[model samples]
Target chain A: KNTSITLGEHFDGFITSQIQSGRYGSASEVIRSALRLLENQETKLQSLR
Target chain B: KNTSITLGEHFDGFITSQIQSGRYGSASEVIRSALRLLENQETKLQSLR
Candidate 1:
């Protein structure tokens, strides 16, 4: 499935830097990593409440 | 600005997990939430450190 996400200017360089970090395989991977952290954060917040 | 990304099998499920958690309303909301947290991780933490 191809998901088209239109992000603002702020994200372009951020995504590029994540790619340049030599950790993520692709832009998609970088985004996936970010989303994972967010999910974890939400879970942590849920436990605290 | 419309970035079309194709996710692997695992991340496709990952997005679903967020929605199922009841924290996110849709796939787009999931991305938006992730972007905000990522911004905090980079922008806020970079300033703190």
Candidate 2:
């Protein structure tokens, strides 16, 4: 459901693959990691402007 | 100085804090972490495109 905000089907595949690999305990862990990285990028971009 | 590539006083402070806290062993470590996070963001942005 939350995957709706993701850009494309590729991201959907990525999220599923993360779960399938069992590298992440859950889909949410992968999402959280990505969001944290996203927030860091947004902060850095804001500083540049 | 390597510090000049970093913009503004805020990044300077953040880098200094990371060093002074000893969380990062060196200034380069802090910069490396920042750049890695930045690169991840760029990759995510590319995926969206």
State the local distance difference test value for candidate 2: 0.67
Quality class of the docking in candidate 2, CAPRI style: incorrect
The TM-scores of all predictions, comma-separated, are 0.68, 0.41
| List of chain A TM-scores, every candidate | 0.78, 0.61
Clashing pairs in 1: none
The candidate maximizing lDDT is 1
Q: Which run of 10 residues does model 1 chain B get worst, by summed lDDT?
A: B23-32
Give lDDT tens digits, candidate 1, residues B1-49: 6777888776778788878979678777778778778867878776977
Chain B TM-scores, listed for every candidate in order, come to 0.72, 0.67
Clashing pairs in 2: none
What C-alpha lDDT values do all the predictions have? 0.77, 0.67
Q: After superposition, how far is residue B48 of candidate 2 from its true place, in Å?
A: 2.8
